[PDB]
Amino acid sequence: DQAGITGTWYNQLGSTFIVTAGADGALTGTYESAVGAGANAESRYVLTGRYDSAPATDGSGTALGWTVAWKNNYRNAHSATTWSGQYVGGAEARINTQWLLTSGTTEANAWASTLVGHDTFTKVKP
């Protein structure tokens, strides 16, 4: 699935996920959020993650995850999102994810530090 995961993906918000899958299980690329703090290189951030480079052959998806820390040369949202999900190959390839967005907070506000949601990615430029 190295070839299948590698490429340019869009989620239902119109965010752009540009990723390279390495033979070793590495995910490297850039994430551009259509939404969030400060809503173009201004909106583009480094991501890293991992994927299962030897998935099951029973038609199971390929487990994968990645992180973005919302700091770049222009902007710092003092937060980080992780996406945890699976790649499903085939004619209309998709990545289905759930995510956790954690903000840096004081101890007093730590209860409210984390948003949760779900993003589905496809290769169709929306």
Residue 83 labelled as part of a binding site:
yes
3-state class (DSSP) for residue 84 = strand
CA distance 16 to 9: 6
Residue 9 labelled as part of a binding site:
no
- Least distance (Å) between residue 82 CB and a second copy: 3
66 within 8 A of 27, measured Cβ to Cβ: yes
- Least distance (Å) between residue 27 CB and a second copy: 8
Question: Would you tell me which residues interact with a second copy (CB under 8 A)?
Answer: 13, 24-27, 35-36, 46-56, 58-71, 76, 78-86, 88, 96-108, 110-118
Per the listing, tokens 């299962």 go with 52
Structural tokens at position 55: 């998935």
Annotated binding site: 31, 45, 83, 99, 111
